[PDB]
Amino acid sequence: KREHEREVIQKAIEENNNFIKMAKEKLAQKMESNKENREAHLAAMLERLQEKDKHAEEVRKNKELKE
Amino acid sequence: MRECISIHVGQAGVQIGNACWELYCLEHGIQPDGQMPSDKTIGGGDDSFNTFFSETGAGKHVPRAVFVDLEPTVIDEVRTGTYRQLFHPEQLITGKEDAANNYARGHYTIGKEIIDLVLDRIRKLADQCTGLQGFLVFHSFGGGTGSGFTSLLMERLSVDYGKKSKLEFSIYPAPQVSTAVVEPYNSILTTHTTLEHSDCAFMVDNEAIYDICRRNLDIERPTYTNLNRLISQIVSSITASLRFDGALNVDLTEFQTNLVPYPRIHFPLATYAPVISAEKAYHEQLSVAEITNACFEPANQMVKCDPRHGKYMACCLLYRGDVVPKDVNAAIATIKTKRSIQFVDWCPTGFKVGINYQPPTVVPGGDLAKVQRAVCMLSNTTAIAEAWARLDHKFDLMYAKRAFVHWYVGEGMEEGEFSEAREDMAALEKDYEEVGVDSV
Amino acid sequence: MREIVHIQAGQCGNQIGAKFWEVISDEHGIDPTGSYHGDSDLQLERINVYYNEAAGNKYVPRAILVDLEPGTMDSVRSGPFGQIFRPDNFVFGQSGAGNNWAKGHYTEGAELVDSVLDVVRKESESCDCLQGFQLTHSLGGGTGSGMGTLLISKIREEYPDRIMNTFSVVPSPKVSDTVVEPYNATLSVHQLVENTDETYCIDNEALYDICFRTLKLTTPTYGDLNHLVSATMSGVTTCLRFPGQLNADLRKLAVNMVPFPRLHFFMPGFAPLTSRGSALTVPELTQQMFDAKNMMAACDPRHGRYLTVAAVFRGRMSMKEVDEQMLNVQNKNSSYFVEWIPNNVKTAVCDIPPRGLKMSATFIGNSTAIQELFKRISEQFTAMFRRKAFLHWYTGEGMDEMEFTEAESNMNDLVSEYQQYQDATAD
Numbered sequence: 001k002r003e004h005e006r007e008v009i010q011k012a013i014e015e016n017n018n019f020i021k022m023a024k025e026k027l028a029q030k031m032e033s034n035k036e037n038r039e040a041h042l043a044a045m046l047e048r049l050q051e052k053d054k055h056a057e058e059v060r061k062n063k064e065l066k067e
Numbered sequence: 068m069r070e071c072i073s074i075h076v077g078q079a080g081v082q083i084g085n086a087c088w089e090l091y092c093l094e095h096g097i098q099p100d101g102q103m104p105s106d107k108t109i110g111g112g113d114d115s116f117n118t119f120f121s122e123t124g125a126g127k128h129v130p131r132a133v134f135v136d137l138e139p140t141v142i143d144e145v146r147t148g149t150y151r152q153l154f155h156p157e158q159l160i161t162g163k164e165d166a167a168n169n170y171a172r173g174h175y176t177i178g179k180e181i182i183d184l185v186l187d188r189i190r191k192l193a194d195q196c197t198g199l200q201g202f203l204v205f206h207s208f209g210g211g212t213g214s215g216f217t218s219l220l221m222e223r224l225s226v227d228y229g230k231k232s233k234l235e236f237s238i239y240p241a242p243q244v245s246t247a248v249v250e251p252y253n254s255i256l257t258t259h260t261t262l263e264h265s266d267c268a269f270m271v272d273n274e275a276i277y278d279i280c281r282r283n284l285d286i287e288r289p290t291y292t293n294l295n296r297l298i299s300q301i302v303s304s305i306t307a308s309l310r311f312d313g314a315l316n317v318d319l320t321e322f323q324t325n326l327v328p329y330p331r332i333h334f335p336l337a338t339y340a341p342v343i344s345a346e347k348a349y350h351e352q353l354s355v356a357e358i359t360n361a362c363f364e365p366a367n368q369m370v371k372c373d374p375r376h377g378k379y380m381a382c383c384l385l386y387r388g389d390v391v392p393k394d395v396n397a398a399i400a401t402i403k404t405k406r407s408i409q410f411v412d413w414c415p416t417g418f419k420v421g422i423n424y425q426p427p428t429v430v431p432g433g434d435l436a437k438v439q440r441a442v443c444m445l446s447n448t449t450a451i452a453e454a455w456a457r458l459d460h461k462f463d464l465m466y467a468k469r470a471f472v473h474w475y476v477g478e479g480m481e482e483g484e485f486s487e488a489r490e491d492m493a494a495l496e497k498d499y500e501e502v503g504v505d506s507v
Numbered sequence: 508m509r510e511i512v513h514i515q516a517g518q519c520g521n522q523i524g525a526k527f528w529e530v531i532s533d534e535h536g537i538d539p540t541g542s543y544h545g546d547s548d549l550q551l552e553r554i555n556v557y558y559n560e561a562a563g564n565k566y567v568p569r570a571i572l573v574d575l576e577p578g579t580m581d582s583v584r585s586g587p588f589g590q591i592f593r594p595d596n597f598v599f600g601q602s603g604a605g606n607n608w609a610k611g612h613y614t615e616g617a618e619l620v621d622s623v624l625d626v627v628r629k630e631s632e633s634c635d636c637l638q639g640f641q642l643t644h645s646l647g648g649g650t651g652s653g654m655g656t657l658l659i660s661k662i663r664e665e666y667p668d669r670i671m672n673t674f675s676v677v678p679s680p681k682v683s684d685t686v687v688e689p690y691n692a693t694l695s696v697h698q699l700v701e702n703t704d705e706t707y708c709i710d711n712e713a714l715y716d717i718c719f720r721t722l723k724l725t726t727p728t729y730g731d732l733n734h735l736v737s738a739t740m741s742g743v744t745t746c747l748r749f750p751g752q753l754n755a756d757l758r759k760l761a762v763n764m765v766p767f768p769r770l771h772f773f774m775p776g777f778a779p780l781t782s783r784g785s786a787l788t789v790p791e792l793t794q795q796m797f798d799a800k801n802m803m804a805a806c807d808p809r810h811g812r813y814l815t816v817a818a819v820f821r822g823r824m825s826m827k828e829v830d831e832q833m834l835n836v837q838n839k840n841s842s843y844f845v846e847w848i849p850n851n852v853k854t855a856v857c858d859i860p861p862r863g864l865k866m867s868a869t870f871i872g873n874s875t876a877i878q879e880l881f882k883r884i885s886e887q888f889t890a891m892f893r894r895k896a897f898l899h900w901y902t903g904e905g906m907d908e909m910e911f912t913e914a915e916s917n918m919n920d921l922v923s924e925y926q927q928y929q930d931a932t933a934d
């Protein structure tokens with residue numbers, strides 16, 4: 001009985017520790033995955049816009065290439 | 068000996084917070100500068116009201132409360148309002164740019180910028196407590212801060228406080244006062260994220276409160292101020308067990324034992340009585356029996372649903388004021404034998420009851436009559452599931468076409484989070500169905 | 508606070524720009540040299556949204572004025588309130604674009620663009636918490652349309668995460684004889700569908716018809732059209748400028764109004780319709796702003812469905828009455844509201860009435876009917892471009908034909924996207 005009493009409080013502690021650990025883990029994966037998604041979505045928006053600059057030099061070059 | 072820390076989050080949480088503190092001050096005889104003449108221990112004590120207020124050496128009684136918003140204009144009113152000397156400026160935290168009704172901003176983009184500062188101010192409050200019991204969190208389901216910030220906070224408090232209980236008071240959205248079409252999105256996301264982290268949640272349906280103001284207080288077009296005063300009475304009835312002591316008082320955690328049969332099934336329905344204007348209460352005591360029976364009338368609920376079409380799993384009654392056992396016992400025995408109330412077969416059919424002698428108070432210039440005796444009932448009914456079905460359906464209508472989804476994706480979310488949240492809700496609705504079926 | 512930066516470009520942009528500032532300055536109770544002399548504190552609570560602080564308690568419009576014509580600059584400085592704009596905030600070119608989009612977007616516009624950005628930066632950088640930008644311009648000319656959409660691309664590069672709002676005036680044969688407008692408009696819309704968050708569609712066809720047909724105006728002037736445009740702009744920005752719960756900033760408005768990123772084109776509405784020189788009830792107000800005749804775009808709302816709607820009522824009226832009438836309106840008109848977006852009409856009530864009106868209503872609709880406007884622009888564009896007319900004006904500047912095709916069909920995709928959501932059901 002006394003060894004069992006010890007296991008029980010041990011199990012309590014363990015399950016509580018494990019609840020915290022899992023929550024920390026799930027929180028951190030969600031944060032970094034949200035950070036990546038948001039970076040990508042902004043990288044792509046800016047490069048689309050960069051491609052507008054390439055195309056606008058290309059339209060002006062083509063103009064001055066007319067004699 | 069057990070301190071509770073209150074966290075008020077976003078506009079709704081904050082505005083309900085002012086109403087609650089104002090009202091607590093009145094209840095305990097604490098003036099807007101924090102002084103309390105009737106308190107003979109200066110600088111500390113372990114009186115019942117000390118679960119909610121700490122005390123300075125100068126005799127100021129300070130709320131065990133943090134107010135948080137991602138934008139400053141609501142909290143600014145608290146900084147300069149009537150109660151501005153009640154709180155240390157460190158307990159009032161604001162950012163510059165709000166969540167724009169977008170859970171994704173409250174949880175990630177904007178919220179992540181302020182979450183360590185908030186934890187930090189919470190840790191200062193926790194550190195002044197000798198036997199911290201837990202947290203009460205006030206917030207709307209619908210706003211971006213109310214939803215995404217609160218849920219982020221709840222995740223982090225689980226990690227930083229493990230043991231510690233967390234109770235929520237959550238404003239559930241109604242079309243008469245809502246301000247965002249995406250409120251169903253925010254609500255499902257925050258419920259999914261918060262479900263594992265909360266011990267008990269009280270939903271306050273803004274429609275239910277709106278209607279109570281129209282119908283019981285003859286207010287034509289109720290404002291936030293009107294709803295918040297009524298909501299503040301319900302909250303005060305529920306925290307009364309911690310704030311006062313008395314030979315018949317039953318503590319909130321004891322009610323909790325009865326109200327939560329399974330971790331996920333932790334959403335009690337509150338019903339409050341009497342809500343009566345001054346003119347109508349003139350020449351009229353409502354007896355113990357009268358106010359008790361009025362807890363079983365759905366017009367008095369604070370969520371719209373019908374318990375007559377479901378099953379009870381618990382029923383608790385929190386009486387305040389001039390109330391004696393003989394009368395409670397008699398009023399309940401009546402309801403029993405008048406068989407109007409059906410329990411699941413796996414749950415004994417009793418009624419846990421508490422009584423606080425302090426009578427309810429009203430704020431000056433309000434619409435509530437001041438009465439001799441009031442009662443708040445907390446039940447756990449399968450009918451509370453109705454509120455989830457109404458929201459889940461609105462979610463489904465929008466999400467089948469991905470309406471508005473691009474606003475969340477643009478802030479970093481994946482559709483996967485939506486369907487995962489909504490599956491969790493489908494499961495919660497199956498849960499409330501399963502607990503209601505008869506045993507084999 | 509949450510500041511907006513205002514930018515006006517080309518003749519139109521500057522005309523409607525100026526009126527807007529005339530109107531809202533009056534509303535906020537400030538004189539032509541920027542002194543407050545109002546009687547109500549609600550006039551100042553959110554004044555920073557649109558104005559900077561000066562010394563001597565002088566308020567200055569956060570406004571940047573641009574044209575490739577130096578002329579309109581002077582006619583701006585001449586009007587009432589011309590003396591309030593920061594003088595560095597005027598940025599003018601040499602030629603004028605002469606109704607050539609490509610000049611506005613690639614060549615002459617480009618050369619001026621950098622000096623505009625400098626004033627934008629100056630304004631932005633000062634800003635405590637900038638919400639974003641509003642651009643007033645026309646889509647048929649060359650500056651407002653071509654330089655204006657270039658400016659927008661350029662600002663979105665430097666502030667990728669602020670809100671970008673236009674007031675875009677759409678062209679009508681009934682108002683301008685230029686043959687080339689369908690080109691300038693199609694190429695504009697191509698840019699806007701990618702680079703703005705929300706665009707108010709002011710249709711000159713609608714504004715002409717209200718003035719002729721409804722308002723009994725004989726031969727209506729630009730000043731006559733602009734009277735409506737300014738009433739509208741006052742109405743749609745009320746929520747931004749006074750204290751209130753609903754759509755109180757640009758992002759919240761976008762979030763409520765834009766369910767799909769490309770469907771961000773609104774038809775505004777107003778009631779009562781008036782001209783200059785001489786009260787409706789809540790129910791008349793309410794019925795009028797859901798009526799085709801009160802729309803500033805030439806679309807019949809009964810030819811589509813609303814995805815979303817905001818209504819703004821101004822004046823001291825009963826809130827319970829507005830609530831009832833608004834419910835009423837949705838019940839009797841339920842077919843015209845997409846069923847798959849619940850609670851998609853929002854309602855604001857502001858006590859402050861406009862100028863010489865006791866009570867009014869402003870309507871902002873994201874309706875699938877707006878495809879009518881695009882299809883009309885589309886019919887004109889394709890009448891020419893098929894017979895490759897006037898192309899030389901544009902290619903001469905370096906533009907390929909392909910760019911015309913792409914823009915044509917991006918606007919066709921758009922139309923067919925509205926149709927798709929008009930047709931969708933709940934199962």
Ligand SMILES: CC[C@@H](C)[C@@H](NC(=O)[C@@H]1CCCCN1C)C(=O)N(C)[C@H](C[C@@H](OC(C)=O)c1nc(C(=O)N[C@@H](Cc2ccccc2)C[C@@H](C)C(=O)O)cs1)C(C)C
Nearest residue numbers: 518522680681682683684715726727728729730731732733
């Ligand atoms: C024959 C050529 C035009 C005179 C005339 N008609 C047309 O253009 C033709 C006629 C029939 C076949 C196709 N349609 C398009 C016209 O009425 N136009 C162009 C007007 C604009 C014109 O009105 C007239 C007839 O004087 C102008 N209005 C103003 C004007 O309003 N100026 C105000 C200041 C101002 C405002 C905005 C722009 C410039 C100047 C000054 C005061 C008087 C005011 O506020 O009303 C300038 S040019 C409207 C369609 C808008």
Ligand SMILES: Nc1nc2c(ncn2[C@@H]2O[C@H](COP(=O)(O)OP(=O)(O)OP(=O)(O)O)[C@@H](O)[C@H]2O)c(=O)[nH]1
Nearest residue numbers: 077078079082165166168207209210211212213291
């Ligand atoms: N009962 C009550 N409800 C409120 C109050 N203020 C807002 N609400 C409701 O709360 C929801 C709107 O959320 P808010 O709390 O204003 O949003 P927030 O948490 O500040 O989030 P953002 O503004 O998106 O950062 C809507 O359902 C409103 O009807 C209040 O004082 N009392």
Ligand SMILES: Nc1nc2c(ncn2[C@@H]2O[C@H](COP(=O)(O)OP(=O)(O)O)[C@@H](O)[C@H]2O)c(=O)[nH]1
Nearest residue numbers: 517518519522645647648649650651678683732
């Ligand atoms: N409502 C209105 N429309 C205008 C005004 N000025 C010009 N327009 C219309 O604007 C278009 C031409 O653009 P404009 O501003 O003159 O060209 P820009 O100066 O190159 O920007 C035509 O469709 C005109 O009929 C105005 O003040 N009010």
Ligand SMILES: [Ca+2]
Nearest residue numbers: 106108111112
């Ligand atoms: Ca004490």
Ligand SMILES: [Mg+2]
Nearest residue numbers: 077078138165
């Ligand atoms: Mg807020």
Ligand SMILES: [Mg+2]
Nearest residue numbers: 604605648649
């Ligand atoms: Mg021009």
